[PDB]
Amino acid sequence: HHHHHVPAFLSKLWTLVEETHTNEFITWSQNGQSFLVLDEQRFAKEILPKYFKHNNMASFVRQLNMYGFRKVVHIGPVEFQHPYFKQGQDDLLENIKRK
Ligand SMILES: [K+]
Ligand code: NA
Ligand code: NA
Ligand code: NA
């Protein structure tokens, strides 16, 4: 029920990150506070078509930016975070707003 009013993109993303089957491509990271895409190219070819019906990483990242996700960088893989996108906490998803 936490997903009714959540944009379909975000609901689908959260479920994708949660799904254990897809951890080889995309996983929770930083104690569930961020998520990690292990290889942009592999992810865009093998995950984006099934889950989002396209194969374009820059368009997926543009949607992340639209909802206020940011990149996590060390002081290829890419890591993103949003304060209301967290492991086992889909009750927070309704807080995520568009630009
Ligand atoms: K996953
Ligand atoms: Na951003
Ligand atoms: Na996050
Ligand atoms: Na969440």
Curated annotation (Swiss-Prot):
Superkingdom of the organism of origin: Eukaryota
Chain residues forming the annotated DNA-binding region: 6-99
Subcellular compartments: Cytoplasm; Nucleus
Coiled-coil intervals, chain numbering: none
Transmembrane segments: none
Summary of subunit composition and partner proteins: DNA-binding homotrimer in stressed or heat shocked cells, otherwise found as a homodimer.
Family to which this protein belongs: Belongs to the HSF family.
Function (record text): DNA-binding protein that specifically binds heat shock promoter elements (HSE) and activates transcription. In higher eukaryotes, HSF is unable to bind to the HSE unless the cells are heat shocked.
Protein name: Heat shock factor protein 2
Organism: Homo sapiens
Name of the gene: HSF2
Residues of the full protein shown: 7 to 110 of 536
